């Protein structure tokens, strides 16, 4: 059992630098490249007393790549795997897909082929990017389309950072997100999502960090993506694999948008005063403001829900906790899936980074759940897109790259097709 990953954009490599430092300290891998069947999923055996991750950080702009080469984690990652481009995507879906995308996929696509040939138990793929930019939108759809036609049957765990409702980093991110989702709607099996102001709200209230940064945001994100793959690494009472995320969460092949959340988030001084059990954290993850997306779950209905625990959590009190969620009428489940619960447990507990913002806890939980609540966000993104599309704003840059007005209409109607599917399935 093994799995490979590729990181795209500033959002990907910043999570890439933050997640692989977490994976190395879990398995006792020192940052100099060296220290049985626990690290074989992500890390390889480089002859004798040396390891290499199964990672390929790709990015067109070279500032992030050489910083990793001149960073602290020099000897861990392969120097050849750290791919760098020549010219930035420049916040354009077309530029990272046709001009700069086509001339760099050929080094990239053949690399993941031979990097998979040395492996034998490749379960699937997981990517890290953000559709708010150019390289995260154009190049990501290109490679994911280029490998889906080759492999197809293997899974694809997308991790995209969508823009917030009112907070935003760019101005043309509806154009970047609406075009790349036209290709991602059919090829991606599942895609977990993260938001900007929502994750700031997590560390503001519970973790009381009044001045956080992206370095702190990626740590708890690393706890999420490391905890979902913690079942295949360490032994568990109920082992789950990456293929469970396709069967239990995707009721229809074109409705493949779960939410993401995590608990308990608690500081050092607050950890010793707050009680740690499954009952209080089971209510915390279902709390609406404790999610990683500004979206009201009370408005919609949960299509499916998955739970994955860590640490010394016995199966008694965790089953009594979810039974209290079923009779709690604050949230409402859809009639099309009454038994929409997938429980998981791993024995290895949540770790802690030296000097990190999160505290050590003897148990944790991460919930991924499909719901019809995210239709209003697509309505919001589609609504604001019509305001700029009516004035033809920021269009001359895309057609200057090689595109036209036609596929903008395809990107509009394809999201319009998604809304009528979300209101139909939500009946």
């Amino acid at each position: 059992r093994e799995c490979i990953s590729v990181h795209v954009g500033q959002a990907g490599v910043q999570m890439g630098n933050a997640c692989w430092e977490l994976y190395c300290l879990e398995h006792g891998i020192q940052p100099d490249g060296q220290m049985d069947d626990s690290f074989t999923t992500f890390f390889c055996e480089t002859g004798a007393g040396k390891h290499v991750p199964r990672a390929v950080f790709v990015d067109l702009e070279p500032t992030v790549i050489d910083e990793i080469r001149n960073g602290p984690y020099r000897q861990l990652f392969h120097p050849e795997q750290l791919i760098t481009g020549k010219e930035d995507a420049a916040n354009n879906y077309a530029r990272g897909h046709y001009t700069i995308g086509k001339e760099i996929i050929d080094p990239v696509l053949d690399r993941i082929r031979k990097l998979s040939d040395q492996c034998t138990g490749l379960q699937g793929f997981l990517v890290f990017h953000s559709f708010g930019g150019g390289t995260g939108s154009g190049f990501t759809s290109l490679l994911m389309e280029r490998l889906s036609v080759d492999y197809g049957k293997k899974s694809k765990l997308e991790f995209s950072i969508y823009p917030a409702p009112q907070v935003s980093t760019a101005v043309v991110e509806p154009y970047n997100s609406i075009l790349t989702t036209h290709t991602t709607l059919e090829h991606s099996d599942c895609a977990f999502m993260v938001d900007n102001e929502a994750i700031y709200d997590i560390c503001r209230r519970n973790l009381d960090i009044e001045r956080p940064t992206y370095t702190n945001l990626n740590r708890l994100i690393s706890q999420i993506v490391s905890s979902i793959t913690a079942s295949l690494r360490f032994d568990g009472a109920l082992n789950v694999d990456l293929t469970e995320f396709q069967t239990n969460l995707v009721p229809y092949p074109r409705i493949h948008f779960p939410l993401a959340t995590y608990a308990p988030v608690i500081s050092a001084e607050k950890a010793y005063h707050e009680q740690l059990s499954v009952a209080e954290i089971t209510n915390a993850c279902f709390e609406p403001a404790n999610q990683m997306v500004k979206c009201d779950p009370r408005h919609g209905k949960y299509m499916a829900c998955c739970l994955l625990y860590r640490g010394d959590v016995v199966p008694k009190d965790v089953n009594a906790a979810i039974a209290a969620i079923k009779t709690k009428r604050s949230i409402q489940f859809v009639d099309w899936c009454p038994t929409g619960f997938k429980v998981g447990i791993n024995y290895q507990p949540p770790t802690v980074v030296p000097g990190g913002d999160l505290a050590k806890v003897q148990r944790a939980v991460c919930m991924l759940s499909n719901t019809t609540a995210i239709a209003e966000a697509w309505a919001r993104l589609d609504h604001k897109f019509d305001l700029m599309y009516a004035k033809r704003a920021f269009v001359h840059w895309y057609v200057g790259e090689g595109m036209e007005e036609g596929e903008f209409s395809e990107a509009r109607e394809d999201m319009a097709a998604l809304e009528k599917d979300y209101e139909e399935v939500g009946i």
Partner: protein, 426 residues
Amino acid sequence: MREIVHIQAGQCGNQIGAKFWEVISDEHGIDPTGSYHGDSDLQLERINVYYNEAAGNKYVPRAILVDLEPGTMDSVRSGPFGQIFRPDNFVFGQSGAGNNWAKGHYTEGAELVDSVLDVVRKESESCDCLQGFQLTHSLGGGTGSGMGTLLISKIREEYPDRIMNTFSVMPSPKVSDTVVEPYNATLSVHQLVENTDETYSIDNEALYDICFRTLKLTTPTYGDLNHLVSATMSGVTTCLRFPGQLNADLRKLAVNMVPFPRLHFFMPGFAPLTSRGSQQYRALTVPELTQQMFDSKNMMAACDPRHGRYLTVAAIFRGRMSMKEVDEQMLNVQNKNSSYFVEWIPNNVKTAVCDIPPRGLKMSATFIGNSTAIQELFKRISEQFTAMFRRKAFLHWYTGEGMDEMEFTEAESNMNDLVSEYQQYQ
């Protein structure tokens, strides 16, 4: 003499199967390394009924562990009794089923089912005279219900005359650790109702319900749940593993418990179930055990028997005891509760006893019941399947492996039929 071929399918089947070899190894007095260190000579009298003799007085078990996930075998092999099993029997795939009945039955199981049939054929021809098959699986998931039910069909084709025994755990709505349970459940009972001669319906919530009231464990794990259900696996095959005053083979249990070819879904139970803080305040005499056996809350299924009528019941006792107190307890237990027993059968109880009780207990028994209350489980399982099937939810993944939606309807046709069959005799 009347060997039983064990086959551990699925994750849960490997766990309870691993616990099954653990609990009986203490009864026979077998070391985890494989050598004998018991005390009684009768342990060697019927050690060949489950084990095979080898050099150096070592006894390897006749276990065939099958699973589509290699991490499960690493946990079973690294267990306390993991080293006694044969390395050749550890056949397994690499890619898991991901809780899909179609994957483990058509594509992921079909590549491995050619590999397991040659292994079980070795254990079948190597024995003197095989009796049946003692299988463990779970109706949930893909590898347990898909691949486990597949080889039941193939073994029925090769050995149509032998007994096909299954200790199958099944889901419930109160405790459900998987979204695709009713689809996997309704597809599995289509094969169990036609092929297998006998099946034990074990509900997971009742494993938790029994540990609160009677055993009152404050920190129960899955290993504690495996201990009580594995004791029932030892109780059903006690008569041929040790001598007794009234022996009842697994075939002798089948004819008394299976009045019709489809009505063979049983309801197991076990006693004494008493905590350490209340062991001294209990008498080991049989009337205190008999009232616990037929108790509505003692069994490991959530179906309340008072809402129906018992079709037929069997109780296999263990330990040296008096037969008059044993037999007379079966009289007053049924006549005082005649409403909960069918009037078109004069005697629903089947008796059996052994002279060699478990280690650490002087008196014990196992409760085996075929009751019409089990249709309540088929009711709620059918409604969960019909609720998700009526809009074709979670079916597009099954169609990827070439599975047709009519087979789900054919499985639905079998569900209401066996439900109405139990309703005929109530």
